[PDB]
Symmetry: D2
Subunit: 150 residues, 4 copies
C-alpha cells in the first residue's frame, strides 16, 4: 500500500502496522540545512509506539515511546552522521513482534524493544524545517515481499 | 531516482529519459469522479514527445506528440475501462529506442512509435479534477533493474 | 550473490553470513511425498550454527545448533502444516546479530537466538527424499535490498 | 515461476512464453575460458523461435531462428565484449509481441523481430564448455513485476 505522508500531517493506515509489517519511507530530497525531523508510529488511541527524532544540530537520532497523556521514557540514541544518503534518503521500519528494526541508508540496523503493546494505526511526520521532502513516499507491506537478486 | 510530481506542475529529470530508461508512476489514490488527466514527457525545448490523455468521460486514453509551437498529430487511442487498479493505480513507461512501451495495471502493453527524435528532460502532470493523487510517486531508472522472483 | 545448492552437498559462501545478511532459498519444485529435509548454516570450523529440520511426517519443523563434535541442544519447534507454498516453496533466513529470523511462505516468522557466536561460512542441504528440488536457488545479500512496491 | 535449466538439456514451461512474458536467466558462475554457449526458445513443435549463440572466441553473440527441420535464416549480430558481468552474469528476454528484447548485464538491449509466429513451450541450453553454471536459474513471469526503487 502506497501513502503520501505530508510534513506536519499523518496518514491513516488501511490496516494495522503489526508484526511482519514493513514500512519503507523514501524522500525525493535531502535538505542539508534542515532541522529536527520527526516520525511517529501512532496507535488508534494516539499513543506514540515509536518516536524517531532525527536531530542534525545535536548530531543524534533519538528513539522513544509515550502514551498520549504520558511522559517520555528513557531515550535510546545513536549518532546522526553518515546515516542518510542524498538525494533520496530513506528509513525502513519492520515490526518483529517484540521489537522494531529500523534501517537507514548506511550503517547497521537499530533495534528498539516495544514498550507499548499495541499495533500502529497511523504514521505521523513533523518538522519545522524538514530534512526531507513533503510528502515522503511510504510503501507499507503486511509481510516482507519477494526480494530481487540484487 | 525518486520524484514527487505534483498536479499541474512538472519535474526536471536529473538525467535525460532515453533508450533503456524506465519511469514507474504510482498514485496513492484513485478518484472515481475524476476528469481528464494528462501526463507529458517533454524535451529540453519543451516539445511534447509523449502525450498521455486519460479520459474517463470519453472512455479512452489518447496518445500523441507535438512540437512546442506545433499542432497535434494523428491520435492513437485505446479504451479507458479496466486499465487502472484502485486504490494505487500506476503507469509504467519504457523507452525502447524506436518506440515507447506504456503499461497500466491491467491489459497488454501499449506501444507508441517515437515521432520527435529527442530525449525527455522533464515529465509534466496536468488535471483540473485529477483521477490520481497529487503528487504521484515517480521512480525513474536508467535501465531495467533486477527483478524479484515475483 | 547467487549459489546453486545441491542436495546432500553444500556451498561455500564468498563472504561470511553475518549480521544484516539475508539468504533467500527457493525451490523449483515441491515433492509433497518427500521426507525430512535439512538445511544447516555452518561456521568455518564446521559448527552447526543453525539447523533447520523440516519433517512432514512428524508435522513439525525443528531448529537447533551443535558444535562439530558436540551434542544437540534443546529443540525449538513449530508445526509444519501450511508453511510452504507449492510449486516453488521458499525459505528466507536473516541474521539479526543476536538471533536469526526464519520465514517460509505462510505464517509468522520464527526467531532463533544465536547459541554459537561465529558467522556462517557455508550452507548445507541434506535429504534422502527431499521436499524440494536439487539444487535449490540461493541468493545471499550483505544487507536487505530495496523493496518493490509489492 | 522458477526453473533450473541444466546444460545440454531444457525445461518445459508450465505456461507458454508469450507477449508480456519475461524470462530472467541467471548464472552462479562465469567461466571466462568457456566456449560457445547457446540458449534456444522452442515452440511445442520444436521450432527454434529464438537462438542466442554466445561465442567468446569469435567475440560475437549471434541471433537467428529456424524451423525444426529447416535451415537457419539470416544472422543478426552484436559484439560479445563487455556484455556479461562476473561472477553472476545474466540474460533477460522479454516477448513484446512483434519482437523479442534481449538484455545482458551491460550495454543497450538487442531487439529481434519474430520470424516464426508461435509461442515458446520450452527453453534449451547447450554447450560443451559453457561460459555459465549448470544449471542456470530461470525465473519466468507472465508480465513485468513491480519494480524496486533500484
Ligand atoms: C540529552 C537529553 O537527555 N536531552 C533531553 C531531550 O532529548 C528531551 O527532548 C525531548 O525528547 C523527546 C524524546 O526523548 C522528544 O523528542 C521531545 O520532542 C517531542 O515532544 C515534545 C513534547 O514533549 C514536542 O511535542 C516536540 O514537538 C516533539 O518532537 C523532546 O522535546 C528533553 C525533554 O524531555 O530533555 C532533555 O534532557
Ligand atoms: C475523436 C477526436 O478526434 N477528437 C479530437 C480530440 O481528441 C482533440 O482533443 C485534443 O487532443 C489532443 C491529443 O490528440 C490533446 O489531448 C488536446 O489537449 C491538450 O492540448 C490542448 C491544446 O491543444 C490543451 O492544452 C489541453 O489542456 C491539453 O490536454 C485535446 O484538446 C480535439 C482537438 O484537437 O479534436 C477532436 O476532434
Ligand atoms: C520429541 C523429541 O524430542 N524428539 C527427538 C528428535 O527430534 C531427535 O531427532 C534429532 O533432532 C535433531 C535436532 O534437535 C536433528 O534434527 C537430528 O537429525 C540430524 O542429526 C542426526 C544425528 O543426531 C543425523 O545425523 C540426522 O541425519 C540429522 O538430520 C534428529 O535425529 C532425537 C535424537 O536427538 O531425539 C528425539 O527425542
Ligand atoms: C560470418 C558467418 O556468416 N558465419 C557463419 C556461422 O555463424 C554459421 O554458424 C552457425 O550459426 C548458426 C546461427 O546463425 C548457429 O549458431 C549454428 O550453431 C548451431 O547449429 C549447428 C548446425 O547448423 C549445430 O547444431 C550447433 O551445435 C548449433 O549451436 C552455427 O554453426 C555457419 C553455419 O551456418 O556459417 C558461417 O558462415
Amino acid at each position: 500500500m502506497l501513502y503520501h505522508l505530508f510534513v506536519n500531517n499523518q496518514v491513516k493506515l488501511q490496516n494495522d502496522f503489526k508484526p511482519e509489517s514493513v514500512a519503507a519511507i523514501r524522500s525525493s530530497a535531502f535538505n542539508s540545512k534542515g532541522g529536527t525531523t520527526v516520525f511517529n508510529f501512532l496507535s488508534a488511541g494516539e499513543n506514540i509506539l515509536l518516536h524517531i527524532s532525527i536531530r542534525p544540530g545535536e548530531n543524534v537520532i533519538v528513539f522513544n515511546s509515550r502514551l498520549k497523556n504520558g511522559a517520555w521514557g528513557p531515550e535510546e540514541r545513536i549518532p546522526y552522521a553518515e546515516k542518510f544518503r542524498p538525494p533520496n534518503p530513506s528509513i525502513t521500519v519492520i515490526d518483529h513482534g517484540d521489537r522494531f528494526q529500523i534501517r537507514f541508508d548506511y550503517g547497521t540496523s537499530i533495534y528498539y524493544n516495544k514498550r507499548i503493546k499495541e499495533n500502529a494505526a497511523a504514521i505521523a511526520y513533523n518538522a519545522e524545517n524538514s530534512l526531507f521532502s513533503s510528502p515522503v513516499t511510504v510503501d507499507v507491506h503486511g509481510l516482507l515481499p519477494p526480494l530481487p537478486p540484487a
